[PDB]
From TrEMBL:
PANTHER family reported in the protein's UniProt record: IRON UPTAKE SYSTEM COMPONENT EFEO
Entry GO MF terms: metal ion binding
Gene Ontology CC: one annotated term: cell envelope
Compartments in which it is found: Cell envelope
Family: Belongs to the EfeM/EfeO family.
Protein name stated in the entry: Alginate-binding protein
Domain (Imelysin-like): residue spans on this chain: 11-242
Binding site for Cu(2+): E55, E58, D72, E154
Length: 251
């Protein structure tokens, strides 16, 4: 595998990220408009679905550490937690909507979220994606899910973590799928192993799908459920890290 072989997959990945950002902009528009309108019910219903586009592009959105913190920080990232004036983004609005059942004081937070999302789109549009950051970032993301997100810290008011996880897994799988034509040439066996490993993770989540095809809240996963999921997600981290090496990206 040579550097030139990575150009097309990376170009396809930028398209994938661009498409997700377009969707994120639209969804965030609808979501923040509902928040501003005081429509608590609609805003809550659009919370997880809106965030999926952002969660899908996490392998590289985490590179823009500035916007990522502003858009997606949790309460414990700020001194005064939920009461901190510097606590912005999705989770600040999540606190108001889900824990307090209220849109009060959230309009300025909604404004800033929309502006941060529009800025993120602008930044990524002018960004050249290094293939090592794409593949490696996906590997780090998988470890983050298993080792840091596993107790449901991300969405501690809505408990919509399964939507985030699903989106994270989809975003990492997209990277695997894009590089499969390169990997399959000399490493078909490994290529299928990664597919099988992702399958196992998706099947694991499918157990927590509801009767009507939605997701359960994260509290439905027992301690055993979480430990097992974490172990299976670790294999994804390991697969992507090995894939980086096989693509010649360690030099």
């Amino acid at each position: 595998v040579a550097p030139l072989d990575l150009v097309q997959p990376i170009s396809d990945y930028k398209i994938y990220v661009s498409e997700n950002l377009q969707t994120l902009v639209r969804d965030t528009r609808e979501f923040t408009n509902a928040v501003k309108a005081g429509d608590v019910a609609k805003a809550k219903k659009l919370f997880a679905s809106t965030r999926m586009s952002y969660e899908r592009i996490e392998p590289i959105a985490e590179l823009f550490s500035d916007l990522d913190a502003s858009i997606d920080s949790r309460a414990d990232d700020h001194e005064k937690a939920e009461k901190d004036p510097a606590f912005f983004g999705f989770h600040r609005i999540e606190y108001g909507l889900f824990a307090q059942n209220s849109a009060k004081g959230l309009a300025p937070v909604a404004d800033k979220l929309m502006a941060d999302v529009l800025e993120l789109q602008k930044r990524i549009r002018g960004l050249t994606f290094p293939p090592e950051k794409v593949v490696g970032g996906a590997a780090v993301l998988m470890e983050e899910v298993a080792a840091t997100k596993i107790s449901g810290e991300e969405d501690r008011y809505s408990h919509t973590d399964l939507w985030d996880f699903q989106a994270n897994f989809e975003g990492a799988k997209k990277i695997v799928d894009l590089f499969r034509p390169l990997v399959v040439k000399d490493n078909r066996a490994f290529a299928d192993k990664v597919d099988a490993n992702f399958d196992t993770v998706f099947k694991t989540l499918a157990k927590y799908r509801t009767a009507d095809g939605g997701f359960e809240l994260y509290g439905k996963l027992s301690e055993r459920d979480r430990k097992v999921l974490a172990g299976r997600v670790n294999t994804l981290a390991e697969d992507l890290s090995k894939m980086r090496g096989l693509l010649g990206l360690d030099l």
